[PDB]
């Protein structure tokens, strides 16, 4: 199941989640609540159809011949 969005408010501090270095592979793990004010939103979406089993497990024609 996917993560739920939390709620943040106005902020004035030395913390810098946005500013980072892409020289390192480190894909920034920032969420929208770090660069704006968000409301709390429960997320009931589930990461189920994206699994490798559901992706690959479907019949698919590979060759048709005659005689």
């Amino acid at each position: 199941r996917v993560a739920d969005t939390v709620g943040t408010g106005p902020t004035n501090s030395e913390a810098i989640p946005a500013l980072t270095a892409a020289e390192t592979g480190h894909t920034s793990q920032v969420v929208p609540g770090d660069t704006m004010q968000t409301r709390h939103v429960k997320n009931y979406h589930s990461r189920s159809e994206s699994t490798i089993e559901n992706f690959l497990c479907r019949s698919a024609c590979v060759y048709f011949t005659e005689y």
Partner: peptide, 8 residues
């Protein structure tokens, strides 16, 4: 459509 996630 196996393992389909319906809207809440």
């Amino acid at each position: 459509m196996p393992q389909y996630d319906v809207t809440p």
